[PDB]
Design a protein around this ligand. Structure first.
Ligand SMILES: [Mg+2]
Lengths: 404, 403
């Protein structure tokens, strides 16, 4: 019989990545997997306009209920795209919505490796980007001279109801930005447990990355991680030989971590950072490794029922330049490994979170990975890694499908 | 013997202070009268003992003299408070200097030696906005409650009218609440400094921000682009850097981290906000070779319009080599990054005070040429020349010999 796919949200995009995933679903998945349990959503920039971001609020609904999501790269309907695609209106990045709609704790940005192919990092690297707070949710104004005041009124504790001044300053410039933001730190307890759990499993030395020396408000991010590590993980890490006795959890300053990403070409490490630091450091990580596509973008949130909501996406966009090449009858060679790593993760999580056909699903997803890696070893991968004698997009799809 | 102009000299500790003591004893003092040098003891212990009056005195001296050389220093963090037996922890001196001297820019440029291959083939220039952002934030660590940010303009048609900038319910038992500002008036000055340096160096300039998401940053780009288009674009075309119709490029901060790893040919410049510049200049140093292979020059302005310039190396005091030294063992400290700082400071001191201009400039040029030439001959330090490289004292003597 075919493998019974567990309930999973499948978010289709457009352009080259949608063309490639249609071939992957048709030729790799569907012959071997009953995907009846998949809930499919059309996130074409058009369909987000045409439905007024209904299809987005429906994806978020399906996500909270099913807890496993594969998302293809999508076109954010920015002002440039409204004109190009003849849309009616402009719409924001879906990330903030998904990060809050699924109680996000982290975006896992991990190095993708190919057995038999050497990339920038020799061994796996793990990165945890705090999924919430910071400047991504800042309120702000561009102003000239005047007085800026920030007050806080606690709702609890011995000073409930008492308004206190957080900051007051005189702006003395004719052109200035004034900015307020918050970092919610309650879920850093869960982030710590998730991160250290993953790092132990992977046998990588974990590091915590902040600017807490100057940005002193960041101290809790560090203190919560050290506390969870010392009480719940330091023993297991010494026992597994990842860390020696007496060795302590190391904090790295954000600016220093940019230097460690370049130095530490052996890999075998893990880092956890705030939202913005993680955005910037993970792109540096991508470039040292190979390119954006060679890092995951795996959102992990916490359901009210205590299980994890996990969304998986490739770290590249829809590759419109290649879709143009295709529609000019020029050969293409899209490496689908980034998106396949995402689909594997989604299918695996769906099987685990629902307890449906776990053994067969994990065996199939592992075989897909093993088959792809072996083609790359033989010089039968895509042209990004195998050079000009590498296979086209379609030749690669067929090469994998024959070997499943 | 050269009469040194008035200059502030900020002394540190550990390996770097020992190295600079020798440089002064063997290279400077036998050829230069350093009467005009005002020296300041910025040991962590001296910051702690004077309750930072020594840092207050450095800022007052810098405003008066306008030319500052600063050795690497130990910031009195909680760990250094333990290690050095201090009474209190203290912040870095940087905020005090950058704000105290009306900072505009921190210029952080790759250090190059003809005939020595480092990470970037051609010079790279970086302009970090010296002030603003989270470096001057107010903040609290709080629980649940209501956070309100108001602004009252003092000028214009809405003067006196308090407006709401932000209002949000904090729903977490543990949260940071943060308010900061970006002062953009001196970005007009940053832009002219940056594009002029890039034009001189013939490098392609880029502006780096997160303005697509952090939209309050839009003016940083608009000010720079307006200055570029009005004052510099045609010059960039005529210098062979850019083609007609090519526009100034904006890079997102996260994309710029990728470009620093990719663009190993160098020949580019980047301008960024304070924090973006902090992280990118550390990345820049590492791709080039190491922390000290980047200059660090703060440019500010006195209320009388005279530029205040401070110069330092981009490395620390290298405690580990001081330890190895005190154990009688061999060291190899490359002093080029520190000497580039001293050269800039003495050159500015000479230019601002008009004291022995011609001879100071010749001595500073010779110091650099003598150092660079020794590296070309495999008689540099072991960081560039390998084990066959000279020791700290051997390198100091070798340079002394050739002046
Ligand atoms: Mg720094």
């Amino acid at each position: 019989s075919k493998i019974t796919a567990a309930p999973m949200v499948y978010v289709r995009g457009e352009e080259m990545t949608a063309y490639v995933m249609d071939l992957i679903r048709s030729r790799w998945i569907e012959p071997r997997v009953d995907v009846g349990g998949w809930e499919t959503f059309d996130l074409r920039a058009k369909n987000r306009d045409d439905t007024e971001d209904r299809v987005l609020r429906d994806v978020i609904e399906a996500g909270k209920r099913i807890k496993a999501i594969f998302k293809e790269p999508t076109v954010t309907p920015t002002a440039d795209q409204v004109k190009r695609l003849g849309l009616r209106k402009s719409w924001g990045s879906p990330n903030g919505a998904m990060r809050r709609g699924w109680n996000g704790i982290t975006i896992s940005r991990d190095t993708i490796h190919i057995d038999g192919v050497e990339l920038g990092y020799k061994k796996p690297v793990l990165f945890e980007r705090h999924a919430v707070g910071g400047e991504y949710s800042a309120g702000y104004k561009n102003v000239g001279k005047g007085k800026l005041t920030t007050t806080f009124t606690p709702s609890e504790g011995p000073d409930a109801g008492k308004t206190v001044v957080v900051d007051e300053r005189e702006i003395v410039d004719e052109e200035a930005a004034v900015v307020t933001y918050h970092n919610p730190y309650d879920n850093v307890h869960d982030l710590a447990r998730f991160f250290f759990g993953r790092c132990l499993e992977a046998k990588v030395t974990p590091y915590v990355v902040t600017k807490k020396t100057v940005f002193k408000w960041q101290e809790p991010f560090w203190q919560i991680m050290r506390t969870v590590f010392d009480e719940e993980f330091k023993a297991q890490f010494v026992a597994a030989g990842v860390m020696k006795e007496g060795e302590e959890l190391v904090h790295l300053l954000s600016d220093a971590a940019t230097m460690k990403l370049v130095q530490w070409r052996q890999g075998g490490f893990g880092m956890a950072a705030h939202n913005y630091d993680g955005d910037v450091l993970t792109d540096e990580l991508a470039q040292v490794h190979k390119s954006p596509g060679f890092i995951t973008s795996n959102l992990v949130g916490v359901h009210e029922d205590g299980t994890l909501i996990k969304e998986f996406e490739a770290s590249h966009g829809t590759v419109a330049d290649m879709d143009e090449a295709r529609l000019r009858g020029e050969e293409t060679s899209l490496n689908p490994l980034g998106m396949v790593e995402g689909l594997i993760g989604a299918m695996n999580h769906a099987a685990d979170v629902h307890n449906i056909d776990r053994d067969r699903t994990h065996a199939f997803t592992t075989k897909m990975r093993t088959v792809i890696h072996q083609l790359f070893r033989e010089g039968k991968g895509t042209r990004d890694l195998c050079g000009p004698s590498g296979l086209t997009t379609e030749q690669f799809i067929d090469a994998v499908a024959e070997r499943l």
